[PDB]
Structures are given as structure tokens and as C-alpha cells.
Amino acid sequence: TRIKKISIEGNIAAGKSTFVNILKQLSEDWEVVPEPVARWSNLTMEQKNGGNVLQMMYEKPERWSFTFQTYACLSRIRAQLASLNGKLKDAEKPVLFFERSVYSDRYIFASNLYESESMNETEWTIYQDWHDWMNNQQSLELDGIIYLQATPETCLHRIYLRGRNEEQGIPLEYLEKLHYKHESWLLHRTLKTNFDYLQEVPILTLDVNEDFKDKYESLVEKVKEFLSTL
Amino acid sequence: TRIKKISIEGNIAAGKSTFVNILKQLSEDWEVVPEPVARWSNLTMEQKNGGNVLQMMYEKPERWSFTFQTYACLSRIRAQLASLNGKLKDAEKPVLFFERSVYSDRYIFASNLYESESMNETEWTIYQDWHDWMNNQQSLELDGIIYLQATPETCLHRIYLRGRNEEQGIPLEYLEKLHYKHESWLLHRTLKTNFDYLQEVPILTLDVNEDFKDKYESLVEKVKEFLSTL
Numbered sequence: 442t443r444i445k446k447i448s449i450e451g452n453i454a455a456g457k458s459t460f461v462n463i464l465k466q467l468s469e470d471w472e473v474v475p476e477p478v479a480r481w482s483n484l485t486m487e488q489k490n491g492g493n494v495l496q497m498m499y500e501k502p503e504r505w506s507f508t509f510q511t512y513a514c515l516s517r518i519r520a521q522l523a524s525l526n527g528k529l530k531d532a533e534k535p536v537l538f539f540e541r542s543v544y545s546d547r548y549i550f551a552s553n554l555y556e557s558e559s560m561n562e563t564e565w566t567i568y569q570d571w572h573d574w575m576n577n578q579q580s581l582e583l584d585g586i587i588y589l590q591a592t593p594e595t596c597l598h599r600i601y602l603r604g605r606n607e608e609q610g611i612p613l614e615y616l617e618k619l620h621y622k623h624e625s626w627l628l629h630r631t632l633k634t635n636f637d638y639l640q641e642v643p644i645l646t647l648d649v650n651e652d653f654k655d656k657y658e659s660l661v662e663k664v665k666e667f668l669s670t671l
Numbered sequence: 672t673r674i675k676k677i678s679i680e681g682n683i684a685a686g687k688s689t690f691v692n693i694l695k696q697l698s699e700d701w702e703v704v705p706e707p708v709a710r711w712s713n714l715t716m717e718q719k720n721g722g723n724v725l726q727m728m729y730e731k732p733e734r735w736s737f738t739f740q741t742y743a744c745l746s747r748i749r750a751q752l753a754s755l756n757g758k759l760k761d762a763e764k765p766v767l768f769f770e771r772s773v774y775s776d777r778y779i780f781a782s783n784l785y786e787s788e789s790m791n792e793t794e795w796t797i798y799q800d801w802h803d804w805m806n807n808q809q810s811l812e813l814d815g816i817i818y819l820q821a822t823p824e825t826c827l828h829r830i831y832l833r834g835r836n837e838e839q840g841i842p843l844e845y846l847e848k849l850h851y852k853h854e855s856w857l858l859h860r861t862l863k864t865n866f867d868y869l870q871e872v873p874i875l876t877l878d879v880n881e882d883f884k885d886k887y888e889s890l891v892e893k894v895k896e897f898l899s900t901l
């Protein structure tokens with residue numbers, strides 16, 4: 442049929458990869474596009490570039506933020522378009538779940554890096570110009586967003602559970618800032634973007650503070666109800 | 672009709688902008704796309720970004736080369752596509768002359784900046800990946816290339832004639848390196864690219880060592896003969 446495109450949004454270690462890997466197993470009509478940055482954070486040219494860029498980012502964010510953000514967003518568009526053109530062609534009710542979106546790339550991450558002075562004004566204006574044009578040159582437009590809403594403290598604890606060495610230094614204050622941006626964008630809907638259609642996109646907010654790995658049936662029921670409304 | 676796409680290639684100050692501004696005046700069926708970098712080197716957001724990036728490049732090329740090259744190539748694709756979709760719709764024999772191409776961006780300039788250590792391997796691999804994908808995601812494929820072939824010494828003298836303050840320090844050695852790349856790509860056809868069709872694209876080589884501003888009729892005759900073969 443026509444593939445429904447749903448973005449899964451949320452803070453670092455809210456449980457997006459966990460949730461998407463749950464969903465993919467529940468229907469042959471359901472496919473997922475993992476976030477390139479998540480895959481880099483685990484042989485391919487993108488993975489080699491991504492692992493180098495991430496390591497350089499941790500060392501010197503004010504040098505590498507523009508390069509990282511442009512490659513993360515390119516990598517995501519390529520991966521989303523490949524799934525959209527590759528998969529679900531025999532499906533009766535096709536749904537593609539994106540682990541985050543080109544909108545979180547710009548309005549959460551790249552925006553935060555500009556706000557932290559890791560990009561200068563020229564880098565940030567080049568990035569927005571690049572993004573505005575790269576997304577118009579639509580096929581990836583979202584039918585819905587699922588917001589996995591967790592407290593900064595939950596996400597800090599989940600960084601600890603996941604155990605990536607590079608992340609154990611990330612402080613609660615950073616997660617608080619990303620949390621505020623997600624709340625402004627997806628709960629209050631106060632954050633202005635350059636994609637008018639986003640103000641009209643339905644949003645499902647799921648509280649994921651309680652562990653769901655062995656107990657996700659209520660969350661998935663909410664997803665199936667939300668999907669039926671689209 | 673179908674618009675013929677012709678790239679004008681050549682070293683710094685070979686006379687490309689001069690030649691393109693001559694051609695545009697000779698036919699209502701002929702239009703030109705000036706190089707964004709050339710326009711930055713003279714109020715628009717691109718011009719402000721471009722003027723900042725160029726100035727930063729002269730100060731610290733090993734910091735800004737990746738950012739510059741990505742924005743120069745994006746800016747060119749946008750400008751070429753805008754002309755291709757905007758212009759020549761009532762023309763009987765439409766021709767769009769590009770001041771350089773996405774191929775000179777990568778195989779002349781970005782390649783030289785990698786060779787000079789102004790981009791590291793990751794920057795250069797990200798750039799080529801970005802380029803390979805950004806050009807496939809064809810509408811800008813060239814029908815022909817016109818190579819304005821000038822000696823490094825001619826180009827050094829023409830930098831002097833043009834008088835841009837920032838360029839008066841550019842040394843003959845740099846122009847010699849760019850000259851060699853153009854000769855390898857467009858005369859010897861030894862330079863390998865990732866665009867198979869380029870090996871088959873017709874090339875017209877014009878010697879522009881002699882001043883042509885008041886005496887260009889033989890050059891244009893060669894252009895009209897070349898166009899009739901396409």
C-alpha cells in the first residue's frame with residue numbers, strides 16, 4: 442500500500458532502540474530504520490567514518506560538530522530512503538518506524554551544539570541552509586511521531602545500564618537540556634520549525650520511566666490504536 | 672526542447688567568467704550558471720555564509736576546507752537545478768553553460784585540499800560519500816565540457832589583472848598543481864572518477880593564453896561547431 446512513516450523520538454537512552462527492536466518483531470508489515478549515530482556507537486565506509494567522527498567529537502566538539510551533524514543527517518536520509526524504496530512492497534498495512542528523524546537531528550542535536558558554541562553562526566546557518574535544501578531535494582514526511590518521554594534521571598540511569606565507556610561522563614545537566622527541547626517540540630508544541638506540516642502531525646506520548654522490556658503490551662496497544670487513527 | 676548542459680572548466684583566472692558572460696549575450700537560447708564561489712568572491716544568506724567561509728579558508732584552510740567544499744558544491748547543485756527548472760522553456764536550441772561543475776569541485780579543488788592535508792582522511796571520505804550520494808539523489812549530467820586551457824603563468828598574470836586582494840598571495844606552484852589536475856582530467860583523460868559516463872562526454876579544448884575579450888569570434892565559432900556535434 443502507501444507506507445506509513447512514524448518517527449520514534451526521545452532523549453538519550455530513553456529506550457528508543459529497545460522499543461523499535463520490540464516493534465519490528467510484532468508484524469511482518471512493520472520495519473524499522475535504526476539511527477546511523479546509534480549504529481556507529483555499537484567495516485562499512487559509513488561506520489568507519491562515523492566511528493572516527495564520534496571519537497573526534499568527544500575530543501573536540503567545537504571542531505567536529507558541523508561535520509558530525511551533516512554526516513549523521515545525510516546517513517539518516519540515505520538509510521530512510523533505502524528502507525522506503527526497498528521494503529514492505531507486499532505488505533497490506535505497511536509501517537516504517539524511524540529511530541529519530543531529520544527534525545531531531547536539526548532541532549534537538551545540531552541546535553544544542555550551536556547553543557553550546559560547538560558550532561559558530563556560519564556553521565549553524567550553513568547547516569540549516571543545507572538541511573532546508575537537502576530535505577526538499579516529500580518522500581520522508583512523517584504520518585506520526587511517537588514520543589518516548591523519560592525523566593533526565595531515568596535516561597542517566599539508562600546510560601549507566603547500557604555501559605558505553607564514552608557516555609559515562611555525560612552529565613544530568615546535558616540530558617536536562619535535551620529533555621527541555623523535546624518537551625518544547627513534542628509536548629507544548631512551542632518550538633517553531635521550518636516544516637509547516639509538522640504542526641499538524643499527530644504525536645503519541647508514551648511514558649517509558651517504568652522498565653518495559655518484559656512488560657510492553659500496554660505501550661504496543663497504544664501504538665496500534667494511534668496507527669488506526671492515521 | 673531538452674536543455675544541453677555544458678560545463679566551462681579551467682584553472683583559476685583562465686577567463687571562465689569572462690567567457691561565460693560573452694556567451695550569454697550571443698543567443699536568447701543561451702543561459703549561464705555562474706560558480707557560487709566566484710559570486711562569493713565579488714546580502715543573500717548564501718553570500719554572507721560564502722564570504723565568511725572564504726575569509727576563514729584563507730586564515731586556516733585545514734579547519735575550513737571540508738565546510739567550504741561541502742557548501743560550494745551544495746550551492747552549485749542548487750543554482751544549476753534552479754536554472755535547469757527555471758530557464759530556457761521557450762528556447763528552440765537551449766544551452767546552459769555551467770561555470771565549472773560538481774566534478775571540478777571534487778576532482779580539482781576538494782582533491783587538492785586533501786592532497787595539501789587541509790582535509791584529513793575522514794573529512795575526505797565523508798566528502799566523497801556525500802558527493803557520490805548528493806549527485807545521485809541524472810538531471811545535471813553534462814552533454815559536453817569546454818576546457819579553457821591557459822598556462823599557470825597566464826593564470827598568475829590574470830589573478831594580477833583581476834586584483835582581488837586575498838588572491839595576490841596565491842603562488843605559481845599552486846596554479847601549476849591545479850593545471851596538472853585539469854590536464855590529467857580533460858586532456859590526457861587519465862584521471863579516474865566515480866561517474867562512468869564522464870569518460871564518454873565530449874571535450875572541446877580552447878587555448879585562451881591570448882587575450883580574447885575584444886577578439887573571441889574564433890573561440891565562439893569552435894563552441895558553435897562543438898554544440899552542433901552534440
Ligand SMILES: CCCN(c1nc(-c2nccc(N)n2)cs1)c1cc(-c2ccc(CCN3CCN(C)CC3)cc2)ccc1C
Pocket residue numbers: 453478479495498499502510513514545546547550551608610611612615
Ligand atoms: C550520547 C550523546 C552523544 N553526543 C551527541 N550525539 C549527537 C547526536 N546524536 C544523534 C543524532 C544526532 N544528530 N546527533 C550530537 S552530540 C555527544 C555529546 C557530547 C557532549 C556534549 C556536551 C557535554 C556537556 C559536558 N560538560 C558541559 C560543561 N560543564 C561545565 C561540564 C560538563 C557532554 C558531552 C560529546 C560528543 C558526542 C558525540
Ligand SMILES: CCCN(c1nc(-c2nccc(N)n2)cs1)c1cc(-c2ccc(CCN3CCN(C)CC3)cc2)ccc1C
Pocket residue numbers: 683708709725728729732740743744775776777780781838840841842845
Ligand atoms: C582563488 C583560489 C581560492 N581558493 C580555493 N578555491 C577553491 C574552490 N574554488 C572553486 C570551487 C571549489 N570547489 N573550490 C578551493 S581553495 C583558496 C586557496 C587557498 C590557498 C591554498 C594553498 C596555497 C599555497 C600557498 N603556500 C603553500 C606552501 N608554500 C610553502 C607556501 C605557499 C595558497 C592559497 C586558500 C583559500 C582559498 C579560498
Ligand SMILES: O=c1ccn([C@@H]2O[C@H](COP(=O)(O)OP(=O)(O)O)[C@@H](O)[C@H]2O)c(=O)[nH]1
Pocket residue numbers: 451452453454455456457458459460479599600602603604651652653654
Ligand atoms: O525499559 C527499558 C528500556 C531500556 N533499558 C535499557 O536502557 C538502556 C538504553 O536503552 P536504548 O538503547 O533503547 O536507548 P535509546 O538511546 O535507543 O533511546 C539500554 O541498556 C536498555 O537495555 C531498560 O533496561 N529498560
Ligand SMILES: O=c1ccn([C@@H]2O[C@H](COP(=O)(O)OP(=O)(O)O)[C@@H](O)[C@H]2O)c(=O)[nH]1
Pocket residue numbers: 681682683684685686687688689690709829830832833834881882883884
Ligand atoms: O582574455 C582575457 C580573459 C581574462 N582577462 C582578465 O583575466 C582576469 C580573470 O578572468 P576571469 O575572471 O574570467 O577568470 P576565471 O577565474 O573566471 O577563469 C580578469 O581580470 C579578466 O578581465 C583578460 O584580461 N583577458
Ligand code: NA
Pocket residue numbers: 464465466467468469470471472
Ligand atoms: Na517486522
Ligand code: NA
Pocket residue numbers: 694695696697698699700701702
Ligand atoms: Na542569453
